[PDB]
Amino acid sequence: EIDTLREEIDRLDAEILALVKRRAEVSKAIGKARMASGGTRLVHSREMKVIERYSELGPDGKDLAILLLRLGRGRLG
Amino acid sequence: EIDTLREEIDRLDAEILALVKRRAEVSKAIGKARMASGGTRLVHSREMKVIERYSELGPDGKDLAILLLRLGRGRLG
């Protein structure tokens, strides 16, 4: 039943949200530590590897990786 | 240590990828069932609610929701 499938989507979104929040926190901590050290951003190596990993899902996986990296980089209040 | 934080990112990405794959499968199944019934797409209600849920993360959360919905909708081979 389609509505039963939708209930599961909502449960999956709970798990995903929990993980994405944790990931964003870890990402932000890396960003701060890096900037505190004057460390070089790892765009061509590590970030590219994150993108490649999610590429498994096709082109939309690349966009997902990009968004997860973005969540790590801060926004203004 | 920053590199230890990076190791955790990679572990979080494993969990997230597993979940996103499952979500995409459930989403695709909904899409098919809906189109098999001539069912109306729930953009204004349900999809908006998914977007609102991820909005917790700020504007980038809205984009994350959009991408997860997109993963459900198919691409060509």
CA gap B75, A43 in Å, rounded: 28
What is the identity of the amino acid at B27? S
A38 neighbors B59 (Cβ within 8 angstroms): no
Chain A residues inside the 8 Å CB shell of B9? 23, 26-27, 30, 50
The experimental method behind these coordinates is X-ray
Whether the CB of A53 is below 8 Å from some CB of chain B: the reply is yes
**DSSP type of residue B41:** P
Q: Are A34 and B2 in contact (CB under 8 A)?
A: yes
Asked if B27 has any chain A CB less than 8 Å from its own CB, the reply is: yes
| Residue A23 and residue A71 in contact, taking contact as beta carbons nearer than 8 Å | yes
Query: Between B9, B54, B57, which is nearest A26 by CB?
Result: B9
Q: Is B34 annotated among the ligand-binding residues?
A: yes
Closest Cα in chain B to A8? B26
The C-alpha torsion from A61 through A62 and A65 to A71, rounded to 10°, is: -110
Q: Which of B11, B13, B27, B43 to mutate to test the interface with A (most CBs of A within 10 A)?
A: B13
Q: Where are the alpha helices (DSSP H) in A1-77?
A: 2-37, 48-54, 59-71
Q: Tell me the Ramachandran region of residue B38: left when phi exceeds 0, alpha when psi lies from -120 to 50, beta otherwise.
A: left
Which CATH topology does A1-77 take? Chorismate Mutase Domain, subunit A (1.20.59)
A43 is in an annotated binding site: yes
Q: Which amino acid is at B58?
A: G
Q: Using an 8 Å CB-CB cutoff, list chain A residues near B17.
A: 53-54, 56-57
